């Protein structure tokens, strides 16, 4: 354990950075999708009805 | 604080430290990994060597 803690720390740092990157990309893509969905709702309300 | 006094050989002095293991620091006296304190050792050939 005393010398495996460092390796586990390195792996934890790498995986945490990967997860943070994925979460940020998902947030940005979801914002874009929300903008497109607002546009689609506006089209549905102002064209169909 | 605590004071743990004993007599060990000069070779096994390195065994009294967090982390590394050995016959002395496996069944006789082992330090915690996050130990806080100091380890004090000195030569005593003139007192214990009968």
Overall description:
By secondary structure, the first copy, chain A, is an all-alpha fold. Chain A has one helix and no strands. Chain A binds chain B through residues 1-3, and chain B through 18-20, 33.
Give the helices and strands of chain A as they follow along the chain: H
Number of extended strands of chain A: 0
Helix content of chain A: over 70%
Q: Could you tell me the radius of gyration of chain A in angstroms? A: 21 Å
Helix count of chain A equals: 1
Structural class of chain A: mainly alpha
Quaternary organization: part of a larger assembly
* Percentage of residues in strands of chain A: under 5%
Shape of chain A: rod-shaped
Keywords:
about 90% helix; 2 chains; Spike glycoprotein; S protein; part of a larger assembly; SARS-COV-2; viral protein
Briefly characterize the structure:
Chain A: This is Spike protein S2'. The structure is cut from a larger assembly and holds two copies of chain A. Chain A has one helix and no strands.
Q: What order do the helices and strands come in, and which of them pair?
A:
This is part of a larger assembly, with two copies of chain A.
Chain A: H1 4-48
PDB class: viral protein
Keywords: SARS-COV-2, S protein, viral protein
Entry title: SARS-COV-2-6P-MUT7 S PROTEIN-DY-III-281 complex closed conformation
């Amino acid at each position: 354990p005393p010398e495996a803690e460092v390796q586990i720390d390195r792996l934890i740092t790498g995986r945490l950075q990967s997860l943070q990157t994925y979460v940020t990309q998902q947030l940005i893509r979801a914002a874009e999708i929300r903008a497109s969905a607002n546009l689609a709702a506006t089209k549905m309300s102002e064209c169909v009805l | 604080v605590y004071a743990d006094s004993f007599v060990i050989r000069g070779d096994e002095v390195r065994q009294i430290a967090p982390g590394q293991t050995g016959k002395i620091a496996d069944y006789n006296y082992k330090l915690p990994d996050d130990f806080t304190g100091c380890v004090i050792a000195w030569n005593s050939n003139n007192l214990d060597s009968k």
